[PDB]
Write a protein that holds these residues in place. Structure first.
Motif, mmCIF file in Angstrom:
data_model
loop_
_atom_site.group_PDB
_atom_site.id
_atom_site.type_symbol
_atom_site.label_atom_id
_atom_site.label_comp_id
_atom_site.label_asym_id
_atom_site.label_seq_id
_atom_site.Cartn_x
_atom_site.Cartn_y
_atom_site.Cartn_z
ATOM 1 N N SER A 113 -1.813 -0.815 8.045
ATOM 2 C CA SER A 113 -2.525 -1.935 8.606
ATOM 3 C C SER A 113 -1.078 -3.070 8.930
ATOM 4 O O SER A 113 -0.681 -3.713 8.068
ATOM 5 C CB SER A 113 -3.477 -2.712 7.661
ATOM 6 O OG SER A 113 -4.025 -3.421 8.389
ATOM 7 N N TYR B 256 0.756 -1.119 0.203
ATOM 8 C CA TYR B 256 0.068 -0.065 0.156
ATOM 9 C C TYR B 256 0.668 1.132 0.011
ATOM 10 O O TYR B 256 2.092 1.317 0.346
ATOM 11 C CB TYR B 256 -1.139 0.187 1.078
ATOM 12 C CG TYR B 256 -0.272 -0.030 2.508
ATOM 13 C CD1 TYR B 256 0.126 1.222 3.105
ATOM 14 C CD2 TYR B 256 -0.085 -1.235 3.372
ATOM 15 C CE1 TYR B 256 0.772 1.178 4.654
ATOM 16 C CE2 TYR B 256 0.691 -0.962 4.347
ATOM 17 C CZ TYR B 256 1.064 -0.022 4.930
ATOM 18 O OH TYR B 256 1.604 -0.016 6.209
ATOM 19 N N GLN B 257 0.070 2.284 -0.451
ATOM 20 C CA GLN B 257 0.951 3.810 -0.398
ATOM 21 C C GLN B 257 0.656 4.501 0.733
ATOM 22 O O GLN B 257 -0.614 4.502 1.256
ATOM 23 C CB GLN B 257 0.422 4.285 -1.782
ATOM 24 C CG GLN B 257 1.562 5.580 -2.018
ATOM 25 C CD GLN B 257 2.812 5.471 -2.460
ATOM 26 O OE1 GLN B 257 3.374 4.061 -2.456
ATOM 27 N NE2 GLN B 257 3.694 6.536 -2.594
ATOM 28 N N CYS B 258 1.510 5.048 1.366
ATOM 29 C CA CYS B 258 1.021 6.063 2.576
ATOM 30 C C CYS B 258 1.921 7.210 2.636
ATOM 31 O O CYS B 258 2.965 7.301 1.668
ATOM 32 C CB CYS B 258 1.528 5.005 3.807
ATOM 33 S SG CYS B 258 3.179 4.731 4.286
ATOM 34 N N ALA B 259 2.091 7.942 3.604
ATOM 35 C CA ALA B 259 2.702 9.278 3.733
ATOM 36 C C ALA B 259 3.404 9.278 5.211
ATOM 37 O O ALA B 259 2.625 8.827 6.156
ATOM 38 C CB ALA B 259 2.007 10.589 3.538
ATOM 39 N N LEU C 179 -0.542 -5.873 11.556
ATOM 40 C CA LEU C 179 -0.895 -6.688 12.563
ATOM 41 C C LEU C 179 0.535 -7.282 13.309
ATOM 42 O O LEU C 179 1.715 -7.370 12.770
ATOM 43 C CB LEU C 179 -1.911 -7.969 12.174
ATOM 44 C CG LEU C 179 -2.430 -7.808 10.840
ATOM 45 C CD1 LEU C 179 -3.574 -9.030 10.766
ATOM 46 C CD2 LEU C 179 -3.550 -6.527 10.888
ATOM 47 N N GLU D 4 -1.809 13.502 0.653
ATOM 48 C CA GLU D 4 -0.973 12.332 0.810
ATOM 49 C C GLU D 4 -0.241 12.270 -0.891
ATOM 50 O O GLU D 4 0.175 11.232 -1.189
ATOM 51 C CB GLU D 4 -1.286 10.964 1.188
ATOM 52 C CG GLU D 4 -1.525 10.734 2.675
ATOM 53 C CD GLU D 4 -1.679 9.347 3.139
ATOM 54 O OE1 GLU D 4 -2.253 8.540 2.370
ATOM 55 O OE2 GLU D 4 -1.333 9.067 4.443
ATOM 56 N N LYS E 171 0.245 5.770 9.167
ATOM 57 C CA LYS E 171 -1.317 5.132 9.341
ATOM 58 C C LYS E 171 -1.475 3.972 8.388
ATOM 59 O O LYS E 171 -1.923 4.159 7.206
ATOM 60 C CB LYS E 171 -2.244 6.154 9.302
ATOM 61 C CG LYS E 171 -2.003 7.534 10.015
ATOM 62 C CD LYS E 171 -3.373 8.443 10.159
ATOM 63 C CE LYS E 171 -3.652 8.651 11.368
ATOM 64 N NZ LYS E 171 -2.618 9.081 12.248
#
Lengths: 299, 300
Positions: B139, B126-129, B141, B290, B137
């Protein structure tokens, strides 16, 4: 809680570049066959009313340039299968994974490897909308980009990009070439139907919020299938079915919240809004998480 | 319309993920050349996390205490050293799938892709900042510790993040590839408080500049504003203050269009006080922060 796409590694090694005349798009190289949309053999003028069967007979093997990086593949045969070109090459792809051709239904999710001139540049997770289109980020030159799902060791190819609609959505076929929705591979005025919200996916997303300890939308009321669907159609929501209740079964038994009990919570969120509140950090109700995605992601 | 949040292809990074086991603890590792990188909280037990003495714990370990597994092939550990908060495991065989790579440390507001793994097996990307409070932020686990973040430029991979902690609020913290933490966080099981998460102002403006290039103009107004006055209003909405450096970065975006940066700030100020009124910008019902200006300038 993020929208995660499958790893693209097994699909990256299969993408190739196909050129016919002045047209270049992406192809799928598996074994000794390269798959690509059949409108690669059409000039800018043939797309108005193309006779693909007549156009393909004129073409020859040397009219196709197939490039896998700097290696050049040689075409020894060509064939057509329902809007998908099949080009036979002389070398089998040594990076061919365990693959399967499957056709998916609207509402199911899959990952898309966006490519440009046979080069992968991005990956994202999306869902087949009920109007048989996908909201993606494709730009001119991304034709032939494929969608896929990944099992333990098996890659399931289920989509190939063919066209971009003026509304910004994209339409395509399966790997056997059958179109998703009432579309044709011609340059003409085509419209996508009214895009409705996948109700079964919203419910699975609400269950994931309860798993994450965000349970302010729960109420003491339950409802009926026919009462909910009457409200659902009013707000442009897909009608629920008995099959949908059974798919959500595992999440209901785990959380202790019945499907019709959760349906009354969703029935409130539409009429009265979200009352300045958020779910999972969003003020919007997500509908691109299938129940199976919730089970895998949360567990 | 339509501006989806795309992540980089993960193929080159999939071949560098391994499984590191020490005692009863198993997490993910990064295999580059003959070195394996992993968080140092793998020689720790559950009880050691309260007040770990990493120097005491590592001196009591031997090479055979570390089990490194690349799928079916077991890697033999021949040396180990600790750099800041990361363990470097020297192995006998160099990774044949090592790509052209670099190590870079990013600043808040920059974006990257994350390859989440569980026991050395990737499961999603996934892509995030990087948030201004130095958290991410995503996911994650349990067992996802050791997952890496990266950007791909040409054919060179830039590793910039390694996941260490989950944190009480559900937002994760980590270090760069040299073992230096992002933010004031430490690898202890202590009460650690993240700061207030504010919206990245420069990312929104670059996103809004891309909207007018795509044909959206309903949020434009005729008013302009000063930098000091905008930051006074933006502070009220928990928005990051704008600096002169941010103004110059948006220069080319404000050169392709006729809108000055301060002209766009007044429009952003009007959006905050009014809202969307049921409308959308580039198919989004909320303001996106983002997307970096670099990602917008390219492929504009």
């Amino acid at each position: 809680f993020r929208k995660m796409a499958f790893p693209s590694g097994k699909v990256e090694g299969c993408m190739v570049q196909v050129t016919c005349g002045t047209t270049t798009l992406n192809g799928l190289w598996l074994d000794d066959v390269v798959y690509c949309p059949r409108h690669v053999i059409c000039t800018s003028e043939d797309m108005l009313n193309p006779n693909y069967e007549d156009l393909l007979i004129r073409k020859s093997n040397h009219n196709f340039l197939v490039q896998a990086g700097n290696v050049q593949l040689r075409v020894i045969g060509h064939s057509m299968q329902n809007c998908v070109l099949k080009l036979k090459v002389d070398t089998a792809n040594p990076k061919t994974p365990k693959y399967k051709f499957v056709r998916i239904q609207p509402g199911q999710t899959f990952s898309v490897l966006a490519c440009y001139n046979g080069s992968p540049s991005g990956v994202y997770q999306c869902a087949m909308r009920p109007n048989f289109t996908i909201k993606g980020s494709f730009l001119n030159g991304s034709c032939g980009s494929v969608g896929f799902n990944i099992d333990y060791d098996c890659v399931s190819f289920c989509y190939m990009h063919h066209m971009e609609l003026p509304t910004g959505v994209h339409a395509g076929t399966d790997l056997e070439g059958n179109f998703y929705g009432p579309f044709v591979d011609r340059q003409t005025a085509q419209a996508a139907g009214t895009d409705t919200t996948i109700t079964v996916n919203v419910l699975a997303w609400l269950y994931a919020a309860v798993i994450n300890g965000d349970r302010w939308f729960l109420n003491r009321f339950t409802t009926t299938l026919n009462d909910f669907n009457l409200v659902a159609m009013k707000y442009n929501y897909e009608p629920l079915t008995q099959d949908h209740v059974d798919i959500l079964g595992p999440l209901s038994a785990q959380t202790g919240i019945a499907v019709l009990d959760m349906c009354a919570s969703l029935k409130e969120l539409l009429q009265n809004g979200m009352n300045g509140r958020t779910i999972l950090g969003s003020a919007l109700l997500e509908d691109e998480f299938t129940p199976f995605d919730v089970v895998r992601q949360c567990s």
